[PDB]
Design an enzyme around this catalytic site. Structure first.
Site, PDB file in Angstrom:
ATOM      1  N   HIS A 292     -10.957   5.640   7.190  1.00 32.51           N
ATOM      2  CA  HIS A 292     -11.226   7.146   6.365  1.00 32.51           C
ATOM      3  C   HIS A 292     -12.192   7.851   6.744  1.00 32.51           C
ATOM      4  CE1 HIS A 292     -12.005   8.066   1.824  1.00 32.51           C
ATOM      5  NE2 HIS A 292     -13.171   8.705   2.824  1.00 32.51           N
TER       6      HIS A 292
ATOM      7  N   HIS B 242     -10.382   0.698   5.668  1.00 27.17           N
ATOM      8  CA  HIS B 242     -10.145  -0.249   4.307  1.00 27.17           C
ATOM      9  C   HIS B 242      -8.649  -0.550   4.413  1.00 27.17           C
ATOM     10  CE1 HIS B 242      -8.819   3.390   2.028  1.00 27.17           C
ATOM     11  NE2 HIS B 242     -10.069   3.901   2.558  1.00 27.17           N
TER      12      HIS B 242
ATOM     13  N   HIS C 285      -5.076  -0.087   2.966  1.00 24.85           N
ATOM     14  CA  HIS C 285      -4.480   1.161   2.266  1.00 24.85           C
ATOM     15  C   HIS C 285      -3.133   0.613   1.918  1.00 24.85           C
ATOM     16  CE1 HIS C 285      -4.629   5.229   0.795  1.00 24.85           C
ATOM     17  NE2 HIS C 285      -5.302   5.480   1.562  1.00 24.85           N
TER      18      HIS C 285
ATOM     19  N   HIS D 204     -13.325  11.271 -11.243  1.00 27.36           N
ATOM     20  CA  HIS D 204     -12.413  10.895 -10.305  1.00 27.36           C
ATOM     21  C   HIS D 204     -12.825  11.257  -8.956  1.00 27.36           C
ATOM     22  CE1 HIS D 204      -9.578   9.537 -13.217  1.00 27.36           C
ATOM     23  NE2 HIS D 204      -9.903  10.334 -14.053  1.00 27.36           N
TER      24      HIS D 204
ATOM     25  N   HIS E 192      -6.683  12.740   3.046  1.00 32.60           N
ATOM     26  CA  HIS E 192      -6.432  12.484   4.411  1.00 32.60           C
ATOM     27  C   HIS E 192      -6.471  13.601   5.506  1.00 32.60           C
ATOM     28  CE1 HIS E 192      -5.071   8.034   3.373  1.00 32.60           C
ATOM     29  NE2 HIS E 192      -5.785   8.393   2.450  1.00 32.60           N
TER      30      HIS E 192
ATOM     31  N   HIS F  75      -5.606  11.706  -2.957  1.00 27.49           N
ATOM     32  CA  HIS F  75      -5.704  10.840  -4.268  1.00 27.49           C
ATOM     33  C   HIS F  75      -7.018  10.744  -4.656  1.00 27.49           C
ATOM     34  CE1 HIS F  75      -7.249   7.370  -1.590  1.00 27.49           C
ATOM     35  NE2 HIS F  75      -6.531   7.938  -0.563  1.00 27.49           N
TER      36      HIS F  75
ATOM     37  N   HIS G 160      -9.833   8.093  -5.194  1.00 27.29           N
ATOM     38  CA  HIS G 160     -10.212   6.866  -4.510  1.00 27.29           C
ATOM     39  C   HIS G 160     -10.769   5.704  -5.434  1.00 27.29           C
ATOM     40  CE1 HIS G 160     -10.957   4.846  -0.745  1.00 27.29           C
ATOM     41  NE2 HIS G 160     -10.746   6.038  -0.190  1.00 27.29           N
TER      42      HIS G 160
ATOM     43  N   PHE H  31      -2.179   8.277  -9.165  1.00 28.39           N
ATOM     44  CA  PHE H  31      -2.931   9.357  -9.015  1.00 28.39           C
ATOM     45  C   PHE H  31      -2.974   9.826  -7.686  1.00 28.39           C
ATOM     46  CE2 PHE H  31      -7.055  11.308 -11.559  1.00 28.39           C
ATOM     47  CZ  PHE H  31      -6.186  12.331 -11.975  1.00 28.39           C
TER      48      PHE H  31
END
Ligand SMILES: *[C@@H]1O[C@H](CO)[C@@H](O[C@@H]2O[C@H](CO)[C@@H](O)[C@H](O)[C@H]2NC(C)=O)[C@H](O)[C@H]1NC(C)=O
Ligand SMILES: *[C@@H]1O[C@H](CO)[C@@H](O[C@@H]2O[C@H](CO)[C@@H](O)[C@H](O)[C@H]2NC(C)=O)[C@H](O)[C@H]1NC(C)=O
Ligand SMILES: [Cl-]
Ligand SMILES: [Cu+2]
Ligand SMILES: [Cu+2]
Ligand SMILES: [Cu+2]
Ligand SMILES: [Cu+2]
Length: 497
Positions: A67, A110, A112, A397, A402, A452, A454, A463
Site C-alpha cells: 500500500h 495487506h 487485497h 470515508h 493505487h 476505493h 479503505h 465502493f
C-alpha cells in the site's frame, strides 16, 4: 527483526489472542501484525509469498498489496484481486518483484482479497532514506519506533452476518489491547524511550474501518511525514488517523521519567479507556513497571487539521488554480443504498478476468472492460482532478488511489481549496455532508489503478472503481512474468471457473 527487501513470506492460519480472546486468523510471518518488510529507497523488493492457508472460513486464496508503492512498470505486482491478478491458490507461491524508485517513507502491506486483511494479514512496510532530509530531527528510527493501530474482531470477516452492524471488539496498538466487552487485563503494548532522546515514531493505521484519535499523555508530536510524503514540521497533540494512513512524528522524550498512556480512540466500538481499552504504555527507561496514572485533557490544544500540513519539498499542485482546472476533471457521485455502495451509479463487483489481463488480451477501451461501468479510462501525461463529495452513509470515508499519491486540493470540513501548497498523500478522508474533498495527480504510470474506500467492509460492498490509466501503453509499460500469467489458469482450475 525486519525482513527484506528480498524475503519469503508465508501466509498461514493460526490461533491468536491479542485481547485475551482466542480466534483463528490469517497471518503473515506467524504474527499479528505481520513482520515489518523494509529496505531503502530505490531497492528491488522480491517478496515470495507462500500461500499456506487451509481454513476456508477466512478464504484459502490470497493476494497481497503493497500500500502506497507506485508499482510503475510492475502493475502486475500491485495485488488487488481481480484488478491486477487472480489470487494465489493454497500450496502455491508467487514472487512480487518490484522496485521503489523515488519513494521513501512509511507504508504497509495487506491482503487485497475480500475482507481477508481484517482476519489478520496486515503489517508495516518501511522504505528508509539514507539521505533523509529529516534525519537530523531525531536520534532513533527502527523497528521499535513503528506504532500500528488496528481494529480487531471476534467474529470472522466472512462470518459477519448480513444485515447486522459491524463493529470491532478491541483496539490493538502494536498487536495488543483489551476487549471492549468482557474486558480482561490482558497485556498492553509498551513503547520504550530513553529520557533526552528523540524518536521517529512511524504511526501506521492498519485499520479495516475505524479512524483513531491518537495521542500520548504529556507529550506532543511533530509530524514530518504524511503517507510517504515528507512534510514541514507540524506540532500537534492529537492525530485523527483514518484507515490506511501513515504519519511519522518526532517524539521528544522530554517529560519526567515515568509511564504515560498512549491513546487510540476509535470512532466506533468502545468509547473511553475503562479497564485499559484503547490504550498502550509509553515507558521511559528507569520508570517503575506499572501502569501510567496520567490523564488526557478534556479538550486537545492542537489537534491535527489536514490543511495545516504542507510538503517539505516544493511540490505545488498540477493544473490550474480553480475547480475543473485540469485536463481531465472528474466529479464522482458516491452513494450508498440498501447495503451497497456505488460510484456513478455502479456498485463494484470484482470481475472474473482481472482488469490488467483483459487489457493485455486486447480490450482497448474502458467501455470494453469488465465490470461494465466500473472501469474509467484516464489519458496519459494529463492532469487529473477528482472531486469526491461526501454524504454516503458510513462516513467519514477514507478514499485511496493505487499507483499514485495526490495533492489534496480540498480537505474535510473546510470549503476552501488550496492550489498552492496542500499536502500530498495517498488516502484521504472525504469528510462529511456537503464537503468536496478533491484530489489531483498527473498520469505518468500506465495500468489499471484501484480507487476505493479503505473501510474494507465498504470496499466489499462495492465502493470502488478502477482507473485504467493509459490503456494504450499498459502492455508495453508492464511486461509480465510467466508466474503472473500462470495465476489465472491455476485459480480458475482450482475454483472450477
Ligand atoms: C465539487 O466540485 C466540483 C468541481 O470540482 C463541482 O462540480 C460541478 O458541478 C456542477 C453541478 O453541481 C456542474 O455544473 C459542473 O460542470 C461541475 N464542474 C465544475 C464547476 O468545475 C461539484 O458541484 C462540487 N460538489 C459539491 C457537493 O460541492
Ligand atoms: C481552510 O483551508 C484553507 C485552504 O487550505 C486554509 O487557508 C489557508 O490558511 C493559511 C493559514 O492562515 C494561509 O497561509 C493560506 O494563504 C490559506 N490559503 C487559502 C487558499 O486560503 C485555512 O486556514 C483552513 N481553515 C482552517 C480553520 O484551518
Ligand atoms: Cl497503493
Ligand atoms: Cu494501495
Ligand atoms: Cu490499501
Ligand atoms: Cu467507506
Ligand atoms: Cu487498495
Amino acid at each position: 527483526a525486519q525482513i527484506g527487501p528480498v524475503t519469503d513470506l508465508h501466509i498461514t492460519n493460526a490461533n491468536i489472542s491479542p485481547d485475551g480472546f482466542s480466534r483463528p486468523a490469517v497471518l503473515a510471518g506467524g504474527t499479528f501484525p505481520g513482520p515489518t518488510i523494509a529496505g531503502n529507497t530505490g531497492d528491488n523488493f522480491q517478496i515470495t509469498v507462500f500461500n499456506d492457508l487451509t481454513d476456508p472460513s477466512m478464504l484459502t486464496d490470497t493476494s497481497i498489496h503493497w500500500h502506497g508503492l507506485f508499482q510503475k512498470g510492475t502493475n502486475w505486482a500491485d495485488g488487488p484481486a481481480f484488478v491486477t491478478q487472480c489470487p494465489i491458490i493454497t500450496g502455491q507461491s508467487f514472487d512480487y518483484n518490484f522496485n521503489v524508485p523515488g519513494q521513501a517513507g512509511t507504508f504497509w502491506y495487506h491482503s487485497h482479497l475480500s475482507t481477508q486483511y481484517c482476519d489478520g494479514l496486515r503489517g508495516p512496510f518501511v522504505v528508509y532514506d539514507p539521505n533523509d532530509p529529516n534525519a537530523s530531527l531525531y536520534d532513533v528510527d527502527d523497528d521499535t519506533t513503528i506504532i500500528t493501530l488496528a481494529d480487531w474482531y471476534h467474529t470472522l470477516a466472512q462470518q459477519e452476518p448480513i444485515g447486522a452492524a459491524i463493529t470491532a471488539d478491541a483496539t490493538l496498538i502494536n498487536g495488543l489491547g483489551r476487549s471492549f466487552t468482557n474486558t480482561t487485563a490482558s497485556p498492553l503494548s509498551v513503547i520504550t524511550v530513553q529520557s533526552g532522546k528523540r524518536y521517529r515514531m512511524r504511526l501506521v493505521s492498519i485499520s479495516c474501518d475505524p479512524n483513531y484519535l491518537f495521542s500520548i499523555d504529556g507529550h506532543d508530536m511533530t509530524i514530518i511525514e504524511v503517507d510517504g510524503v515528507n512534510s514541514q514540521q507540524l506540532t500537534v497533540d492529537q492525530i485523527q488517523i483514518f484507515a490506511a494512513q501513515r504519519y511519522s512524528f518526532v517524539l521528544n522524550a522530554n517529560q519526567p521519567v515515568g509511564n504515560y498512556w498512549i491513546r487510540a480512540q476509535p470512532n466506533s466500538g468502545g468509547q473511553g479507556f475503562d479497564g485499559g481499552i484503547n490504550s498502550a504504555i509509553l515507558r521511559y527507561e528507569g520508570a517503575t513497571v506499572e501502569d501510567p496514572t496520567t490523564t488526557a485533557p478534556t479538550t486537545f490544544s492542537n489537534p491535527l487539521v489536514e490543511t495545516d500540513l504542507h510538503p517539505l519539498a516544493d511540490l505545488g499542485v498540477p493544473g490550474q488554480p480553480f475547480r475543473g482546472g485540469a485536463d481531465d476533471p472528474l466529479v464522482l457521485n458516491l452513494a450508498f443504498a440498501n447495503g451497497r455502495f456505488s460510484i456513478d451509479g455502479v456498485s463494484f463487483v470484482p470481475p472474473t478476468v482481472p482488469v490488467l489481463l483483459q487489457i493485455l488480451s486486447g480490450a482497448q477501451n474502458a467501455q470494453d472492460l469488465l465490470p461494465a461501468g466500473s472501469v474509467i479510462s484516464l489519458p496519459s501525461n494529463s492532469v487529473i482532478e477528482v472531486a469526491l463529495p461526501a454524504g454516503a452513509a458510513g462516513g467519514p470515508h477514507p478514499f485511496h488511489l493505487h499507483g499514485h499519491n495526490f495533492a489534496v486540493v480540498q480537505s474535510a470540513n473546510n470549503a476552501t481549496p488550496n492550489y498552492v501548497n496542500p499536502i500530498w498523500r495517498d488516502t484521504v478522508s472525504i469528510g462529511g455532508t456537503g464537503d468536496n474533498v478533491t484530489i489531483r495527480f498527473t498520469t505518468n504510470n500506465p495500468g489499471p489503478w484501484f480507487l476505493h474506500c479503505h473501510i474494507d467492509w465498504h470496499l466489499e460492498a462495492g465502493f470502488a472503481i478502477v482507473f485504467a490509466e493509459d490503456i494504450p501503453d499498459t502492455a508495453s509499460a508492464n511486461p509480465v512474468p510467466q508466474a503472473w500469467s500462470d495465476l489465472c489458469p491455476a485459480y480458475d482450475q482450482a475454483h472450477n471457473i
